[PDB]
Short mmCIF file of C-alpha atoms in Angstrom, two decimals:
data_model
loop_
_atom_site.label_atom_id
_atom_site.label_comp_id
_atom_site.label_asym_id
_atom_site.label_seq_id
_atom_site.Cartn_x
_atom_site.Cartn_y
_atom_site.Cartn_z
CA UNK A 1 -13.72 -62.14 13.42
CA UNK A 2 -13.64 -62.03 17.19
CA UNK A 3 -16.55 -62.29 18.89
CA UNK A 4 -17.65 -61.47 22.88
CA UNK A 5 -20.98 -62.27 24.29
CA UNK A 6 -21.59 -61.11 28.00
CA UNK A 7 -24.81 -62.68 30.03
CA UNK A 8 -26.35 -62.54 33.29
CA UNK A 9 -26.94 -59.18 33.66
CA UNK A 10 -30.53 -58.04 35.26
CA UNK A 11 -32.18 -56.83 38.02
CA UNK A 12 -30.13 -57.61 41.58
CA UNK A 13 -30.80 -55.74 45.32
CA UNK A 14 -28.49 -53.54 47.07
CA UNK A 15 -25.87 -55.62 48.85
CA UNK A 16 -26.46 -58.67 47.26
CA UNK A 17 -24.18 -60.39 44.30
CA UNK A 18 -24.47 -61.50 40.63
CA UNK A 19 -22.42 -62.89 38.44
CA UNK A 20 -21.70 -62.45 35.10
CA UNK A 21 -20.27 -64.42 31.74
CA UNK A 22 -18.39 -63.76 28.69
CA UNK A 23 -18.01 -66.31 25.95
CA UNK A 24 -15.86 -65.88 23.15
CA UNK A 25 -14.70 -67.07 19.96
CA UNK A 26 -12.70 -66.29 16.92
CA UNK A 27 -9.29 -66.27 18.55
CA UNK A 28 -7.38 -68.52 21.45
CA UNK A 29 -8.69 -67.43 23.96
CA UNK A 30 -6.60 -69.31 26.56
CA UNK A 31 -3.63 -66.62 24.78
CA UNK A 32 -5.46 -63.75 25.74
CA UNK A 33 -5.51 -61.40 28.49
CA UNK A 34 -8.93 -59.80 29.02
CA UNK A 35 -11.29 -56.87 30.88
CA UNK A 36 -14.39 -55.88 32.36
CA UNK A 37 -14.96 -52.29 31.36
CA UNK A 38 -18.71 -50.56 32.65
CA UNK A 39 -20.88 -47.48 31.20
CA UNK A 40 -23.23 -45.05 32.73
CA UNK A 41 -24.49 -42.45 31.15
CA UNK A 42 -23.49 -40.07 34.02
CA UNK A 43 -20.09 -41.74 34.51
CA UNK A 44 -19.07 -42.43 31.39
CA UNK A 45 -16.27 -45.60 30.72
CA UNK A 46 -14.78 -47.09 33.86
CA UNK A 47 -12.30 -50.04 34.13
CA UNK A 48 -13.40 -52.50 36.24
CA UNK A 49 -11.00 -55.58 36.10
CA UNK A 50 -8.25 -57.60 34.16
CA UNK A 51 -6.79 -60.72 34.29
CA UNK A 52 -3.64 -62.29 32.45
CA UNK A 53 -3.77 -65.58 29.96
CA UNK A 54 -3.42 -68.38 32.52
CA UNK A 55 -5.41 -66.65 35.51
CA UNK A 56 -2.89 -65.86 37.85
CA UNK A 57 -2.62 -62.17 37.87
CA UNK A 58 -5.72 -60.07 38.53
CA UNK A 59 -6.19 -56.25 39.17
CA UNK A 60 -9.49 -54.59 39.76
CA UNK A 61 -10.14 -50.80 40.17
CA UNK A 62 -10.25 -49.48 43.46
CA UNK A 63 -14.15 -48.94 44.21
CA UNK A 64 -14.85 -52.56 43.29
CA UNK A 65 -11.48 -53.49 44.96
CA UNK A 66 -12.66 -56.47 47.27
CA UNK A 67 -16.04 -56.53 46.46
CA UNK A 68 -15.61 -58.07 42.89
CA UNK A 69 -13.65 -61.12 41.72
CA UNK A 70 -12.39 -61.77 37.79
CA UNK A 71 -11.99 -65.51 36.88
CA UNK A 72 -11.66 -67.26 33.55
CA UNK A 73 -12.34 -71.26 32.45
CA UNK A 74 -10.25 -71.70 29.15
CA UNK A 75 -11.41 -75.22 29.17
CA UNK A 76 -14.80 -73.45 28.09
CA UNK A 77 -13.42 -70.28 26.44
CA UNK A 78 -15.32 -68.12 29.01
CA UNK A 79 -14.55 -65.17 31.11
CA UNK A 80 -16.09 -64.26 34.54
CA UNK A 81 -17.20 -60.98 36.78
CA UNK A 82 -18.73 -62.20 40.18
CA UNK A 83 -19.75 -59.39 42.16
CA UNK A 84 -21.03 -59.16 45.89
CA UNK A 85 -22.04 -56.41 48.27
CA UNK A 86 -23.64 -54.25 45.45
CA UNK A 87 -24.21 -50.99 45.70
CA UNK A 88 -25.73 -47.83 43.20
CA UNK A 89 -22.38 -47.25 41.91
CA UNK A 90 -22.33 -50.56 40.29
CA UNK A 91 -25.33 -50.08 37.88
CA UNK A 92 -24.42 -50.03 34.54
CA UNK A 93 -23.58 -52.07 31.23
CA UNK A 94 -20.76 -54.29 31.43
CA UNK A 95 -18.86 -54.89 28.52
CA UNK A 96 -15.97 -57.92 28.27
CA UNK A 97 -13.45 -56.47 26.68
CA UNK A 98 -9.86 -58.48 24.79
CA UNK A 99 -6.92 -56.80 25.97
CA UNK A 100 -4.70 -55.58 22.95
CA UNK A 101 -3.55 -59.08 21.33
CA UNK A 102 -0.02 -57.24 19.36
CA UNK A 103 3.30 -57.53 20.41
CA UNK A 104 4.65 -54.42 18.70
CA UNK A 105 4.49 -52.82 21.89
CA UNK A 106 5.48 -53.43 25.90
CA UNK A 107 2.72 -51.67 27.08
CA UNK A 108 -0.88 -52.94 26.48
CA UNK A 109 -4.16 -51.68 26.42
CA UNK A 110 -7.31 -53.18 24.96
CA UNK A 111 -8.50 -53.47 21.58
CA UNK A 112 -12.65 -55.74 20.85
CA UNK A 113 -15.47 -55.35 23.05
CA UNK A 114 -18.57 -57.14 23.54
CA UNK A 115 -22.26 -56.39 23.03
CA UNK A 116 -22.47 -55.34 26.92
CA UNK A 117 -24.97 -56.55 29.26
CA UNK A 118 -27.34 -54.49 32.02
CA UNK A 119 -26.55 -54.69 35.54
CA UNK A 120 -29.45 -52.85 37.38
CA UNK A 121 -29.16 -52.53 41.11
CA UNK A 122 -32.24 -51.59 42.41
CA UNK A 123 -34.78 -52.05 45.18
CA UNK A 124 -38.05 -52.17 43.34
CA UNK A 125 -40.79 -54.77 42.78
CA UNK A 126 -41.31 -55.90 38.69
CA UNK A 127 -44.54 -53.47 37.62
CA UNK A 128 -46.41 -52.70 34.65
CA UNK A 129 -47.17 -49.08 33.68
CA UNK A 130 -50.28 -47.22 34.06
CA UNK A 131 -50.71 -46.12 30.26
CA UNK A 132 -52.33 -42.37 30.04
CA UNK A 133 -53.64 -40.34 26.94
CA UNK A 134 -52.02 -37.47 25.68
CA UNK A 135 -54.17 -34.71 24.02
CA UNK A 136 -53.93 -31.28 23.95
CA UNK A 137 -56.81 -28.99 24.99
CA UNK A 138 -59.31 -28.15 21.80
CA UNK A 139 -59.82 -25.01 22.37
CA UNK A 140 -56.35 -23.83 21.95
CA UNK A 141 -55.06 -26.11 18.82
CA UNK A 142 -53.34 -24.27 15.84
CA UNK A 143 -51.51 -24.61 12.84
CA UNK A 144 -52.70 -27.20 10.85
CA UNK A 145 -50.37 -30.23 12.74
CA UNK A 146 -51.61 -31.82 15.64
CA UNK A 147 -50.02 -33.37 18.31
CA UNK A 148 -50.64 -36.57 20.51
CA UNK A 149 -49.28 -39.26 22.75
CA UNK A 150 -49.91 -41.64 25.49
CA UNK A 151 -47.74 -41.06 28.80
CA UNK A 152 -46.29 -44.74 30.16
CA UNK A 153 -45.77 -43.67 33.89
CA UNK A 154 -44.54 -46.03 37.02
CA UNK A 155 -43.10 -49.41 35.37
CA UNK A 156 -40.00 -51.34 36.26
CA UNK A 157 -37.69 -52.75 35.02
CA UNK A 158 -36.82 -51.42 31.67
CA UNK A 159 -38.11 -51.71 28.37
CA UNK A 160 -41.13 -50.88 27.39
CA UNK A 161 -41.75 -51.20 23.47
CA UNK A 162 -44.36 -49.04 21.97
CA UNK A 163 -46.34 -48.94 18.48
CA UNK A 164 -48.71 -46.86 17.16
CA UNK A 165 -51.91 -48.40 15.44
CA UNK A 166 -50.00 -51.63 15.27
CA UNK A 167 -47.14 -50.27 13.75
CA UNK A 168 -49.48 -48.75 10.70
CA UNK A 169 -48.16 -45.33 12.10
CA UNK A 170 -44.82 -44.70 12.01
CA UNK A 171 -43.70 -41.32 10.64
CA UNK A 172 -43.69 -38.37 12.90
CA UNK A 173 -43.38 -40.48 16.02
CA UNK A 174 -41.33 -39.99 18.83
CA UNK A 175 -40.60 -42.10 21.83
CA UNK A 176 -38.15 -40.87 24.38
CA UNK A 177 -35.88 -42.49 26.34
CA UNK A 178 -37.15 -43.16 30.19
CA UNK A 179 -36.57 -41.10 32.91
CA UNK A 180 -35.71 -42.44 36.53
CA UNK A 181 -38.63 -41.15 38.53
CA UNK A 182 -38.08 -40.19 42.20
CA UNK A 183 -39.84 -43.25 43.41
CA UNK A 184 -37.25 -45.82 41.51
CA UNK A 185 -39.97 -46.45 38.95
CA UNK A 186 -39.54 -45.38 35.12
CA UNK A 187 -41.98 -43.30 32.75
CA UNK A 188 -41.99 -42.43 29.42
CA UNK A 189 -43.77 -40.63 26.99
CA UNK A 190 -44.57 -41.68 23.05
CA UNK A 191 -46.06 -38.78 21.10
CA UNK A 192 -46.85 -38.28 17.15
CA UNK A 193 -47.96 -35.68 14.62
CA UNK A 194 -50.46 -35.64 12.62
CA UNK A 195 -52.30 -33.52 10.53
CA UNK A 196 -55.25 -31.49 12.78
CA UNK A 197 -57.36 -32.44 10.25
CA UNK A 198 -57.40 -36.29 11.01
CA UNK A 199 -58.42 -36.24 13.81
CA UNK A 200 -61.94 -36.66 12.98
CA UNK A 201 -61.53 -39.62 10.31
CA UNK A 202 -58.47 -41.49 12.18
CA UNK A 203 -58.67 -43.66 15.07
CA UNK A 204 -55.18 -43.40 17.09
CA UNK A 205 -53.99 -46.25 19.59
CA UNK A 206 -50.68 -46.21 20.83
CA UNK A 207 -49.74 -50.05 21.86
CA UNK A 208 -47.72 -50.29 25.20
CA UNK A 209 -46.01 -53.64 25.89
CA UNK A 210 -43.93 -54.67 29.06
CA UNK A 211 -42.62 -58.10 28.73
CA UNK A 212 -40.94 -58.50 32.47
CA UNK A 213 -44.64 -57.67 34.18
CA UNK A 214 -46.14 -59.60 30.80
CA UNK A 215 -48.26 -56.55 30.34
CA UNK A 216 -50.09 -54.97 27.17
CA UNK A 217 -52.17 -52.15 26.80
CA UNK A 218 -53.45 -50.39 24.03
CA UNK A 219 -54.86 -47.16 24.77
CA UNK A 220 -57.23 -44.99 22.06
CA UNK A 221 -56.57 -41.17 22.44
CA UNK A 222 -59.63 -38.87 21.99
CA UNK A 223 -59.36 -35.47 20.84
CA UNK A 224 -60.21 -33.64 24.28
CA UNK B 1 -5.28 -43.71 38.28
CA UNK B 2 -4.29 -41.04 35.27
CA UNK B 3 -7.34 -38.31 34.69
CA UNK B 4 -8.01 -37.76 30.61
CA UNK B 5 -9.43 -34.41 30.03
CA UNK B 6 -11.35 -34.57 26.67
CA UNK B 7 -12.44 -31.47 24.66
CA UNK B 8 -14.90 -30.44 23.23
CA UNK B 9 -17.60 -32.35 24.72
CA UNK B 10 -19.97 -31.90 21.45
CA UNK B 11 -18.98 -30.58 18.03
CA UNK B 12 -21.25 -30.23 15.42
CA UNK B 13 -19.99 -31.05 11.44
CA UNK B 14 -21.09 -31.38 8.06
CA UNK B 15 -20.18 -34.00 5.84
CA UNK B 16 -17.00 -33.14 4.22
CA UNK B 17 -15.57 -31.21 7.23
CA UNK B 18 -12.50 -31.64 9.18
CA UNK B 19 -13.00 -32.22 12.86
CA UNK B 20 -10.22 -32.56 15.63
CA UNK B 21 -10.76 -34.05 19.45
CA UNK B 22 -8.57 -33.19 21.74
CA UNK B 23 -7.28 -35.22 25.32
CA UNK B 24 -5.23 -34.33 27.99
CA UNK B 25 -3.43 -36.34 30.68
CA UNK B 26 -3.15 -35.19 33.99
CA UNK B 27 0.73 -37.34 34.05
CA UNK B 28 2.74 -38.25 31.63
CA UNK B 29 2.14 -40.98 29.45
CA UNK B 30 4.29 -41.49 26.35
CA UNK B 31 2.24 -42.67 23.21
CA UNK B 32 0.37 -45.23 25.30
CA UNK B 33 -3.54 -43.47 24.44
CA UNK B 34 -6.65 -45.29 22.15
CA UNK B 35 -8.95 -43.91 20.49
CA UNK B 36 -12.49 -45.40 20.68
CA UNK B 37 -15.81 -44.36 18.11
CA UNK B 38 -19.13 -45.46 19.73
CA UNK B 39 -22.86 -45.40 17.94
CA UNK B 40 -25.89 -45.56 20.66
CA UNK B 41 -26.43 -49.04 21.51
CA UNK B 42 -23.18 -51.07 20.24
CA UNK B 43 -19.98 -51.33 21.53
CA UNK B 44 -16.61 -49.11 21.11
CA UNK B 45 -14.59 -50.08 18.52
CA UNK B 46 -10.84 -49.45 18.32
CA UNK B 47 -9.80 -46.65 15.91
CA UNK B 48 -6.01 -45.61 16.61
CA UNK B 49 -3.48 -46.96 18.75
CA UNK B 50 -0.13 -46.16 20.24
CA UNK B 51 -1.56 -42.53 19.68
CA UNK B 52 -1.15 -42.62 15.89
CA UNK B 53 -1.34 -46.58 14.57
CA UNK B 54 -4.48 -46.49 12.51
CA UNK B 55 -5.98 -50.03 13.30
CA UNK B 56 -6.94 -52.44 10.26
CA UNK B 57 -9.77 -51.70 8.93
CA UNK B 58 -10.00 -48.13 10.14
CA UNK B 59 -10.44 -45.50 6.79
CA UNK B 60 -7.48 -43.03 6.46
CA UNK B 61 -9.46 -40.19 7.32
CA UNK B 62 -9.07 -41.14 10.43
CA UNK B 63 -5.51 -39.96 12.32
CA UNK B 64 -4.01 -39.56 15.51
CA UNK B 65 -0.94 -37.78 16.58
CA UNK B 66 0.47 -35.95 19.95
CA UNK B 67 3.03 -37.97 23.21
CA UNK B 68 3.07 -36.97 26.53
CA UNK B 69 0.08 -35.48 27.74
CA UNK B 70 -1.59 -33.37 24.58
CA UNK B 71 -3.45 -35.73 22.32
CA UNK B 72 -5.96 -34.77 19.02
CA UNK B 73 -8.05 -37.01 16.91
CA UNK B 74 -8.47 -35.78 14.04
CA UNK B 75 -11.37 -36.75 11.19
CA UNK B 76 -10.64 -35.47 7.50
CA UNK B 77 -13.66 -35.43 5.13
CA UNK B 78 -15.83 -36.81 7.82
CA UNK B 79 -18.36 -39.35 6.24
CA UNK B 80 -22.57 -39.86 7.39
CA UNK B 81 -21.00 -42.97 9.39
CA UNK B 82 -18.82 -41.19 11.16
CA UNK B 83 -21.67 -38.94 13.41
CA UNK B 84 -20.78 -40.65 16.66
CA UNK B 85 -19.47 -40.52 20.44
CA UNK B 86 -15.27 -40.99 20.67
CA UNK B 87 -13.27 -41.27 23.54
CA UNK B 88 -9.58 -41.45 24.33
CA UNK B 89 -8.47 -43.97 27.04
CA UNK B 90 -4.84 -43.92 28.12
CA UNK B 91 -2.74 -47.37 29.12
CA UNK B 92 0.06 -46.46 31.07
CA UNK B 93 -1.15 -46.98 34.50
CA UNK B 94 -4.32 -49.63 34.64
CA UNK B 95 -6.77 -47.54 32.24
CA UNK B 96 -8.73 -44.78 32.25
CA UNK B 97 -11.04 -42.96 29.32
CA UNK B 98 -11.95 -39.47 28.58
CA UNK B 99 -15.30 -38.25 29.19
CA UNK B 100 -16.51 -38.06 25.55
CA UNK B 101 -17.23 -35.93 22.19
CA UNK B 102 -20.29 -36.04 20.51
CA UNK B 103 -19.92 -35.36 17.07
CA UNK B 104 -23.15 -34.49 15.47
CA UNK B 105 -25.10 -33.14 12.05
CA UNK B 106 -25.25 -29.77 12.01
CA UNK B 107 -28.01 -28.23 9.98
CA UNK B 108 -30.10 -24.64 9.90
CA UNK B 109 -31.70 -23.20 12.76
CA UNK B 110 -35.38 -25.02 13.20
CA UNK B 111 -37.60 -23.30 15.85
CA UNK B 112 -39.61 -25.98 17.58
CA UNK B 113 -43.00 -26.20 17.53
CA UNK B 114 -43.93 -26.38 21.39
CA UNK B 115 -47.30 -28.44 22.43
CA UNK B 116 -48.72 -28.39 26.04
CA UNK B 117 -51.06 -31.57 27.54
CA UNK B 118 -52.87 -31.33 30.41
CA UNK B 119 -53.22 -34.64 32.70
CA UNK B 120 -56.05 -36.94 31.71
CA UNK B 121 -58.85 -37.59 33.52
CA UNK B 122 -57.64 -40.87 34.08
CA UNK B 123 -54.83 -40.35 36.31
CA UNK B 124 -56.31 -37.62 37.77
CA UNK B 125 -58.59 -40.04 39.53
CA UNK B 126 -55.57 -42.04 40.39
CA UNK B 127 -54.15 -38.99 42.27
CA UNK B 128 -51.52 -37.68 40.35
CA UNK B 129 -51.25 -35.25 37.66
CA UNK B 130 -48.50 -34.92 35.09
CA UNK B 131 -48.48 -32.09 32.62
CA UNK B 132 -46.46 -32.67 29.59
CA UNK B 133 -44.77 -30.50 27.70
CA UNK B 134 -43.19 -31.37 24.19
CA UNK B 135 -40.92 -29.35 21.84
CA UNK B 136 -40.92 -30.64 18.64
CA UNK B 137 -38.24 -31.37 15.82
CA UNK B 138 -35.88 -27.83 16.31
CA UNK B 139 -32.01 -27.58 16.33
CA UNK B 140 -29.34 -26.92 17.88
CA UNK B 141 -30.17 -29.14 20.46
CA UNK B 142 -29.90 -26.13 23.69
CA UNK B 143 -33.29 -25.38 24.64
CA UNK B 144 -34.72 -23.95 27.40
CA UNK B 145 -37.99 -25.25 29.37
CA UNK B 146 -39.24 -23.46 32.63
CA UNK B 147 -42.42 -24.34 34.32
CA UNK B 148 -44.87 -21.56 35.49
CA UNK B 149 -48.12 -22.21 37.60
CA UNK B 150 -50.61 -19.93 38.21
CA UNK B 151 -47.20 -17.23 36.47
CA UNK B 152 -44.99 -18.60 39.54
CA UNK B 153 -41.93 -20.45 38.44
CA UNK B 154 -41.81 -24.06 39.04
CA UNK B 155 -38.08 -26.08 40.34
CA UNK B 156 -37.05 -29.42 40.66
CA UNK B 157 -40.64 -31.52 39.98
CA UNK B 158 -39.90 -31.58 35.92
CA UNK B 159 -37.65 -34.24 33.77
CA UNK B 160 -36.82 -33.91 30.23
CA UNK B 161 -36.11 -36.25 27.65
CA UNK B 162 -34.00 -36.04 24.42
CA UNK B 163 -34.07 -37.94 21.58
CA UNK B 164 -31.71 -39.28 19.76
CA UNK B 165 -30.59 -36.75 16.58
CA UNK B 166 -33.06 -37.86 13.60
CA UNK B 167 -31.72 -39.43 10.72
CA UNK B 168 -33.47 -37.88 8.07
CA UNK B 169 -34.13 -34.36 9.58
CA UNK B 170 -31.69 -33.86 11.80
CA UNK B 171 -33.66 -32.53 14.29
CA UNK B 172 -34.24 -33.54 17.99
CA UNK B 173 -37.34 -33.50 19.95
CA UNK B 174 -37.41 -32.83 23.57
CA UNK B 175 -40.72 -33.68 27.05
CA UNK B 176 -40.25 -31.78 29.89
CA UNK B 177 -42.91 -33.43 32.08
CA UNK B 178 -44.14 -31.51 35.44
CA UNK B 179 -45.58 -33.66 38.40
CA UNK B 180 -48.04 -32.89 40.75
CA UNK B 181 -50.39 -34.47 43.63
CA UNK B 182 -53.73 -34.31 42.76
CA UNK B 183 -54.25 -31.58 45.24
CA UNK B 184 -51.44 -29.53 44.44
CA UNK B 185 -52.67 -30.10 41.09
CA UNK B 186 -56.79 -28.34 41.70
CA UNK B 187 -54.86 -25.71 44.16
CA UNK B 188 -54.09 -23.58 40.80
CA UNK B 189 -55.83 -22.60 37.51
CA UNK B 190 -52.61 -21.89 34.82
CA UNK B 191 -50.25 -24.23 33.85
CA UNK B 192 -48.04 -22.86 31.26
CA UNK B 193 -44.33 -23.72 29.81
CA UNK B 194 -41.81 -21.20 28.28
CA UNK B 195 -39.58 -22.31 25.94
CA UNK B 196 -36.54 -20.06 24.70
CA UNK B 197 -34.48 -21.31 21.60
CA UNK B 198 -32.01 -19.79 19.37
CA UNK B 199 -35.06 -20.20 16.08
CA UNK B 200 -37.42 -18.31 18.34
CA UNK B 201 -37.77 -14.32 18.40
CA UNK B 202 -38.61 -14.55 22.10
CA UNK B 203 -39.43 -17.00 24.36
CA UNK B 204 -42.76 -18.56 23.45
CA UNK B 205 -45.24 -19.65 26.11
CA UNK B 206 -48.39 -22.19 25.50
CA UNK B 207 -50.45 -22.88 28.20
CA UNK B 208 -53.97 -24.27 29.33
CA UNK B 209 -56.53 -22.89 32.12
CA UNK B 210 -57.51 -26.55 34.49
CA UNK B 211 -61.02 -27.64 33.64
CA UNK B 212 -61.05 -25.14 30.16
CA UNK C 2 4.60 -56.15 38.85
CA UNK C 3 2.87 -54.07 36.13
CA UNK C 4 -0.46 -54.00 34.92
CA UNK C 5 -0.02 -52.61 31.91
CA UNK C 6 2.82 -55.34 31.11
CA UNK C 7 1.61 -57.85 28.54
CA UNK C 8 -1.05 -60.21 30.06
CA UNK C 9 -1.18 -62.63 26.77
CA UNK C 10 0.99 -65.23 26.14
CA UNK C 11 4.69 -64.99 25.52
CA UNK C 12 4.74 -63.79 22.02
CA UNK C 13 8.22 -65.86 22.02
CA UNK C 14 7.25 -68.89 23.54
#
């Protein structure tokens, strides 16, 4: 099977430049023409760059279009993206992508991708999150299910990984995918349900980890 | 340099059902259109070519047909694996994709059940407040969240979250998270969000009184 | 030139 692995993707300033690799197997690679394709969730797919067999043709779409240079080493069966001057825009995932390998037909498109990797473009400073308890007010609760969670606010750069109990809680949880706060800084929330009637016999800690700060914290949530 | 129009931008199927995409070009461009399927996480991976070559490996159910500038997808007896995101991308001139369809479970009306948190003490002291509100396992995914402090609206200091349709259920979940200074926070007593959703009579509205 | 032409090898060479 063919195979595409993209690295060197991660956390780079405005203006500045990174460069990324693709190294692949399971075909000749030196035979094959081959892509840089991006995703966003807001953009959706966006061509980025090709470049023939042998290296001597290149095209690039027109916002990267000077700022971004496609280069290839078949001695080591690896594609390149280098990019400079970096700009919002140019956050995304970056997938390396085989052009279509056929010769049924004369004009050509592309047909394996990679696994992608990030390319965040940002300004802020590696930070932990401030881990806060969820709970609903007492007074008001109803129904027989309760609800809880622990809010993971003001951390960069994504992931965070969360648990509940050590992973002895699994069903009924839900942890949503971060938001981009205002400030450039991400926050989630993880919550679960659980019968209202637990609460009094069953200790709940949600377990936040953040490898890039090298961060923990487990937080107990009290009924209010 | 060739604009792909994709409709619809979600559909939602049951297992068994026949579902068609359709695509657009904004220029002519022959047969020269893919079809890509992509799960949350991985990587596209080539259905149909050429506008109708079904790629090896690709079930039958899958088929593509149109030239020129009107191209449909179409999914016969569509299959759990097939819930997905698929996009056309045309090759005439350098290559460009369509924006999308989301092709997800459909399944009866659930009403969520809507939860309201005030902020902890905790970050209170730090100077912020965030109030979360959560609406929990309910479908179709269209919701509606608005904000209301002390009964006046609130705009623009709430984000929401989605998850991910669930597996088993087939539900989705949904935060809507308001934030605050600390002393816009202690200005006002109610905090209270409305949610309106197709498996709701009315809008519903939970709320808490600060300090109750 | 045309980049959409075939950027792999010659499939005749």
């Amino acid at each position: 099977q063919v195979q595409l692995v993209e690295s060197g993707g991660g956390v780079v300033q405005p203006g500045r430049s990174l460069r990324l690799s693709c190294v692949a197997s399971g075909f000749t690679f030196s035979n094959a023409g081959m892509h840089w394709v991006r995703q966003t969730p807001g953009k959706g797919l966006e061509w980025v760059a090709i470049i023939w067999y042998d290296g001597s043709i290149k095209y690039y779409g027109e916002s990267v279009k000077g700022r971004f240079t496609i280069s290839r080493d078949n001695s080591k069966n690896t594609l390149y993206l280098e990019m400079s001057s970096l700009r919002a825009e140019d956050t995304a995932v970056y997938f390396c992508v085989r052009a279509y390998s056929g010769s049924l037909y004369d004009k050509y498109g592309m047909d394996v991708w990679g696994q992608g990797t990030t390319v965040i473009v940002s300004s802020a400073s590696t930070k932990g999150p401030s881990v806060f308890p969820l709970a609903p007010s007492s007074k008001s609760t109803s129904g027989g299910t309760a609800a809880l969670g622990c809010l993971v606010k003001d951390y960069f750069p994504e992931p965070v990984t969360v648990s509940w109990n050590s992973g002895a809680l699994t069903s009924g949880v839900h942890t949503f995918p971060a938001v981009l706060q205002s400030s450039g800084l991400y926050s989630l929330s993880s919550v679960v349900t659980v019968p209202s009637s637990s609460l009094g016999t069953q200790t709940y800690i949600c377990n936040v980890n953040h490898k890039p700060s090298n961060t923990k914290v487990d937080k107990k949530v009290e009924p209010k | 340099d060739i604009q792909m129009t994709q409709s619809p931008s979600t559909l939602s199927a049951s297992v068994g059902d026949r579902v068609t995409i359709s695509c657009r070009a904004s220029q002519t461009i022959s047969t020269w259109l893919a079809w890509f399927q992509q799960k949350p996480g991985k990587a596209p991976k080539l259905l149909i070519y050429a506008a109708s070559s079904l790629q090896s490996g690709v079930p039958s159910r899958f088929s593509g047909s149109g030239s020129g500038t009107d191209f449909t997808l179409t999914i016969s007896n569509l299959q759990p694996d097939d819930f997905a995101t698929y996009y056309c991308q045309q090759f005439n001139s350098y290559w460009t994709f369509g924006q999308g369809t989301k092709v997800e479970i459909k399944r009866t009306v659930a009403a969520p059940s809507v939860f309201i948190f005030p902020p902890s003490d905790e970050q209170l002291k730090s100077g912020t407040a965030s109030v979360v509100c959560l609406l929990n396992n309910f479908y179709p995914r269209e919701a509606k969240v608005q904000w209301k402090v002390d009964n006046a609206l609130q705009s623009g200091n709430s984000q929401e979250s989605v998850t991910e349709q669930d597996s088993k259920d087939s539900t989705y979940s949904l935060s809507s998270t308001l934030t605050l200074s600390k002393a816009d926070y202690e200005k006002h007593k109610v905090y209270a969000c409305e949610v309106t959703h197709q498996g709701l009579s009315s809008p519903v509205t939970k709320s808490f009184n600060r300090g109750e | 030139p045309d980049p959409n032409a075939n950027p792999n090898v010659d499939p005749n060479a």
